[PDB]
């Protein structure tokens, strides 16, 4: 038995959750139970908290989606068959260079893209406030809010900070499955191959290192689940043989190890550094460095 999938599922009364300082009135009702999810993790769905901040986020989030959707339908001539066969090719592009950073572009020529960007902007930031408040209400640390910012930073640099510094909305990323891929490829070409950007190399190290570390940590915990290893919080407050054997497997293997609490610090930084470094690399492209190959030749 490898404990990848449970052998026997067990169920009881729905869990409504800790109360602490949260406004119980904004908590929805419990959802249905999924036997399917039950084989891998918990079977219980819901309840979900839905305050005003969350309602605002969901609303503008849907509006962002809607805006993109309507342009795609127009590009499809309102024909469902065409909409589905060309779904990955449609693309909501930003204002042409001539428009600079103005909001004067006509709807079908960048205006829809700006509207779409406004909705996404609010959706994302309000959701960020939410991750902070739901943590505050339970008296927990703000580690989830902080980590979320690292991801937000790459997103912000790509569609807002860099375009503004370049002085043109045309520098931002369009909304499309294949179009945003073409944009990414083009971005590298235009700046002299990003493999020469030191920050792109670090970002890759961390993207690789995250899969390396999680494969490591995930397999470790499961390897000591026979000692209740996944109950990490208690193993932190009162170390058990699980935490000891896990630390020793690594010490005997590579010369050093972590603790039940410390490993999660290595984890949060490995991931966070991915978009933190990536953001810097992109922010420097086109504003300070036009060609990383050339830049590299002088360094």
């Amino acid at each position: 038995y490898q404990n990848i999938f449970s052998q026997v599922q067990v169920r009881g009364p729905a869990d409504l959750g800790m109360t602490e300082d949260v406004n119980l009135a904004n908590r929805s009702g419990v959802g249905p139970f999924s036997t399917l999810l039950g084989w891998f993790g918990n079977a219980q769905l819901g309840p979900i908290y839905l305050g005003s901040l969350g309602v605002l986020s969901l609303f503008s989030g849907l509006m962002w989606f809607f805006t993109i959707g309507i342009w795609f339908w127009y590009q499809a001539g309102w024909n469902p068959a065409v909409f589905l066969r060309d779904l990955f090719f449609f693309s909501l592009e930003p204002p042409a260079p001539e428009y600079g950073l103005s909001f004067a572009a006509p709807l079908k020529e960048g205006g829809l893209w700006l509207i779409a960007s406004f909705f996404m902007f609010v959706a994302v930031w309000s959701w960020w406030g939410r991750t902070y408040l739901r943590a505050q209400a339970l008296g927990m640390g703000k580690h989830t809010a902080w980590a979320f910012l690292s991801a937000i930073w790459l997103w912000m640099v790509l569609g807002f900070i860099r375009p503004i510094l370049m002085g043109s909305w045309s520098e931002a990323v369009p909304y499309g499955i294949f179009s945003h891929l073409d944009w990414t490829n083009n971005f590298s070409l235009v700046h002299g191959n990003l493999f020469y950007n030191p920050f792109h190399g670090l970002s890759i190290a961390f993207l690789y290192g995250s899969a390396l570390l999680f494969a490591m940590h995930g397999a470790t915990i499961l390897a000591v689940s026979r000692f209740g290893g996944e109950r990490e919080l208690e193993q932190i407050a009162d170390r058990g043989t699980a935490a000891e054997r896990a630390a020793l497997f690594w010490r005997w293997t590579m010369g050093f190890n972590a603790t039940m609490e410390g490993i999660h610090r290595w984890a949060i930084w490995m991931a966070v550094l991915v978009t933190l470094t990536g953001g810097i690399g992109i922010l420097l492209s086109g504003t300070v460095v036009d060609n990383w190959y050339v830049w590299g030749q002088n360094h």
Partner: protein, 246 residues
Amino acid sequence: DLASLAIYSFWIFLAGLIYYLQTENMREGYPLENEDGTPAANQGPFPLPKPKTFILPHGRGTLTVPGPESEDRPIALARTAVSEGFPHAPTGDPMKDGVGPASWVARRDLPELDGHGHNKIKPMKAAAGFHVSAGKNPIGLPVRGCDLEIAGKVVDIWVDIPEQMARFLEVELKDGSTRLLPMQMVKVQSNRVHVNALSSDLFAGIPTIKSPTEVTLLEEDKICGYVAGGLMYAAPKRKSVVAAML
């Protein structure tokens, strides 16, 4: 050049971080010791982090680390060579003395509580509303050991209430008593529950629990350590796959 100043500062930062992370992961197990328990000369390049204190809920005190090593019980092992770096063999019975892959730690002799203060784990018969929702129900099934003999029968399932999961199987032995077997160490089959880590004759020796309605962290560690120990220490009694295939 801005890009050059940035990449330069980043490495300064990364080194500072790794330094911080590493010392932070020294809240447990340090200072290092010689194989005789005395302070080791080399403690490495990283110094010990300053103490931090955890405020434990449900009136269970506090935890401060770094701090004095908690383990103090006797360890039934003896040195094998005069020089450092070699095994220390069991002076008695490793399964009973709790050493090697059968080690256990002196965790708090109380049960783990949930957010409310209720026992985290509990026998299903006493867990209001809990039932088997999917898969083969093991209750009532005979339990087989690695020696291919029946060691008992499952009389219940102990569930983790907050996480709604099976954690132990309560097994009744020939003498009418019972022991808890870790779920992640058993194999539920259609006509039995197979336990590869233990031979039938070793079940009786499984550490017991004070109360029949709860299990403490101390007891869980003793139980889990002992069962895992059978992988190494019960090998002589473990029959081949072709024998089991019959």
